[PDB]
């Protein structure tokens, strides 16, 4: 009777947030791996420039261990800050790893540890020399930068270093947008992002890394979750307004605009196209279940918190509930109207196992062949009967 | 049901202001670069005239470092004030740079540091001499001013110095309007502004800088963000009324009238044309999402603060959300109606990848062929059917 | 009549806090002197030990400029902290000076500037070498430490560095107690404090500086006010409880226990002895003005704030109002009763020009020959006449 | 007038808690030293017994570094717990040190690190072998235990290990009572404490360490504050009732009864004897100041918190304010009645510089020659006039 179809509505609402309450224990604590991070101790551009040159080689090195590669990645990302050690320690929320910050101090060809020389320090120098030699020999004499003069370049002015660093930072931060969603299909939007900043003159194109190095970094960025967690944490903190933003921060925040809501196009297309833009083909006894599920997802997205846009980047388990497959019918209808309306929408890969072409066809007919679709009019257009016809004539 | 399409609206409203709350930390602190600014210590007209000539030469110089160019620009912008050091120190909000104000004191051909002569001073003296020599040799003997007599001109009267400084400041401040939006397509609106100010006799046309120097300064202004931030801060402070305004301040505010809302013609054109000028073609079930996004953008713009008009100049990350691309349909409709209505609108470059020519055609038709479009009439026009027919006859 | 003698009291109360209200302007801004501070960039024990040895040499140097000596003192005082630059920048309230923090980086025999070598660095290196040579040649080959082996000592263990640094900091901090009150009459209380800390095993006696270096450092500390202000700020910050205190902080607070209320023995002795310890000779119609002045001074001391005990160290102008001379009669009475009562009091130098020997004699008599002086008894001692007689018998 | 002597009472009360408010900053952060702690990973008695044998030798070793000695001390104290690593990490509040817990795993003659053998592990084995060889050679073949059979004893039963460990724990925990107050004058109460537990059969006397080893441990315990802080933290946590107490915990809590209020006998004797046991010789114009100061100290002691009894052990700077010297007169009177009443009181060393024998003599007369001292009688003893005489006759 009347109680039925309302008990279920509460039942489905209760089922979604079934056991996601309370606080977990410390027994389920992941084993931690030591990660050695080489941060610049001083503000001298000559040491900082030599440091970021070293961090570039470690990432490009094929003989480098993964833990060393994460250290180079953490060294690069925090290079812009005046106190990289403080930034890493105050913006790290990775239970998987423990970070041991190492102040570099001075600069040899590699890094001088300068701590009880001879005692457990000599082998580290030999290891780093092997890292540098293998990195340079691995490539065909090709420097990480697209310009061979940008590698063996002497930097002493603070102004040049800041411009040089930001270009390295910006090019790395470009990859996060499509590092885990479709890393192979990248280099098109990434080039478009780089071209945009070049025209804005925010980045000096002289310090442009080659695509060989970018592929190596992107492979590192996809494999490792700790680096992704650190960069997502930076994005959220930078997103919070209130303080003055520097040139490095403004670029990061601008890049974070493209990063948000990545990897969840199937869910958001359903919200924007299938659900909104109210079409008379919604209530058809095959979307009422999906509409109920979608309503629960909106509450779940609001309940998650500030990490909701970057769910795919952090690989949250909540993401699977958001993916199409739990509401294949409405999503199929949503992609039907999406391809017809949005020209860009159509390069999306939607060859899933629950396409349901009949509902896809209905969405295609909904955009054009269904009706003009005049919604509630606050302004009273009594003579708009022909106005719809002219609009419908197209 | 009824809850749907309102839950979704609240969801989009919450998603717009998702994580832009709270206060950030000091860990994300940009590295600062020292910027040396040469300000006049006294009010003697000859010293100030020599100082602004030196600043012009340094800006024109090709061998000048970028920091020196920024120092020269800051010296120029604050020349009108009787206390340039106080003006710079009390109107600087640039975390990227730290300004070390230097009182010039006396004046040689260059500038006498007058601080422990021989100790760390002769090198700076020879550097400034090299700067001046390279600046003079670089051009084909052409002075920065369009009149060769305006360069080697002796100034001893305060009024003449004030007039020349006002002209130089005005000619500098014309460039900010189209320095980052379309610097290449400039020199038309800039020439129009210069002609307008000449016809108003606010600027003496004798001190007119050549177009080569103007191009060099526009390139410098586009490259650097600190100068843009300082000039935007000056514009914001001058805009606040309450006190007496001098000739320099009046000219600066008149220029800032044109400066405001630059680089956001898409959003404001969308508002003014698509949103206002209520057309029966608005409520069409394909514009509701765009209207909701536009409303959220309106609240965001109100929330941003006094820096909202100058977001493109400061390169705020919030600007990307304002750009068309999140509402291409309504934007295309508004561009169509604007191009049909506003004759000047049509020189705008709108060859984007989301043009949607169908909606552009729909807007073009809605502008003219749609109907007369009589809105709510407070005055009762009983017999205005024939008036509407005659108006539609055109 | 009745109103008079109360109008006078209100008049004196208003006169005490006559013009000490409102906020001052920025026009009265002292000229600032640049002070170069060499702080350790890293946590390596060898670098910190070499840095503190260099600071000791610079302080002992006779050819050192005063600014260099202040920089060395600031380097020494902040050596215990893991981030000396942050400690100095966040605990500096000196309008007289501006501090330019310099991260040392690596360390040669002196300090490597490591910033554009050859450009304005070689002269500083030669100056530092001259400073070291003059410091070493000035004494008769006598190292700053009382043990010649403590100077040319290699430090690589963190614990040894911490112990040596704590000892040096403690020996420095002993001097502040009697640096400006009576620097010449020192070396007795200072030696007592050093012996106390040695017997407590808080300080390793191996790193004990010679008395020549201690005299030089005490002279430097008395001459300079910025160092005193910095150390008083450190004392005030450490005094505020709430957080865990390290060995250095505990030693500093224990020394500040002796530091407090220094140089104001006259006022506090007057309070404790003349005002408290109620004697029948107090209300005698020659002490009412002094009592009113003392009450006003107590109100002023409560009004001053947390800087009240260290008024002599900061050389506050309000201190002169606290000194005896505005209440010579009650002060003399209190010093008489103190010299008769307190055995230790009597080594104080009170050969002032307002001794008033009659009141000193009156206080001496009031201490012993006056009466037993039984005050208000909560317990009813009805048979205490014989007890009072026996007590007066002595 | 009446306001005077009440303004001072508030003034002295306000002066005590002058600047002890608010929260300190993190700038004053002590440099941390790494401390390596060898904890047993498993519960096997054979490994635990071999571990505590190793920790005994390290403490006895003369060639051992201080940091190693602290690690042995931390290893011993936490040996009773089933999870020594959890106990140390959850009961450590030492900002001076950082503890790196090392699970021992298996057991060779020394300790097998078992982590990448050959890589930075071989030298550690050689160092430990040097530690063991020097420790055994330093003594004249004397084992740490008073019984030579207790050293080379095989332990496989859990029951024997628990009894053996507790004896080692109890003997170490005896020293804390008089480790910093008067370490030289120890071995009398310490032997008395040990004899008491032997008669109670809580400790098996077979595992009794020689006095040569106890002196070495006590010297370590006095020098190092980190060990004292850890053991004080254990005392407070064990003091908090609510849970079941094991044999190890019960001994520690029983020992903590003697540890409490150590090193503050001068203050507490004044409270118990001078202030309490109300004598008609209190109000004499020479104790009113001391009574006021004593009252302020009681509030300060209550304000400190649970760490108030162990102020001397933690070497809190607040302790100096509690020491006699700020109230020498009443303390001298208090010790006067203390020596006459308490036979044990009189072995205390009170040869200070502020003895004031006249007030000491008055205290001596106060106990016996002053009066019987009949206080307020709730029971009405009308015929007690002769009862006092018989009591006074003695």
Numbering used by the authors:
A (entry chain E), B (entry chain D), C (entry chain k), D (entry chain j): 1 to 394
Authors' text:
The first gene encodes the nucleoprotein (N protein) which associates with the viral genomic and antigenomic RNAs to form the helical nucleocapsid. The paramyxoviral nucleocapsid assembly entirely covers the viral genome, protecting it from detection and degradation by host factors and serving as the template for viral mRNA transcription and genome replication. Here, we determined the cryoEM structure of the recombinantly expressed, full-length, and tag-free HeV N protein in complex with E. coli host-derived RNA.
Subsequent 3D refinement of a curated particle stack comprising 5638 particles and using D14 symmetry resulted in a 3.5 Å resolution cryoEM density map, revealing a previously uncharacterised multimeric nucleoprotein assembly. In the HeV N protein assembly two rings stack ‘bottom-to-bottom’, where the globular N-terminal domains (NTDs) intercalate to form a dimer of tetradecamers. The double ring assembly is approximately 12.5 nm tall, and each ring has an aperture formed by the Ct-arms that is approximately 7 nm wide. The HeV N protein double-ring assembly is formed through extensive lateral interactions in each tetradecameric ring as well as intercalating interactions between two tetradecameric rings. A defining feature of this HeV N protein double-ring assembly is the gear-wheel interface between the two tetradecameric rings. The Ni protomer contacts two protomers in the bottom ring (ni and ni+1), with a total calculated buried surface area of ~ 545 Å2. A clear, reciprocal hydrogen-bonding interface exists between Ni and ni+1 with the residues Lys120, Glu123, and Glu124 where the two Glu residues in Ni form a tab that interacts with the Lys residue in ni+1 and vice versa.
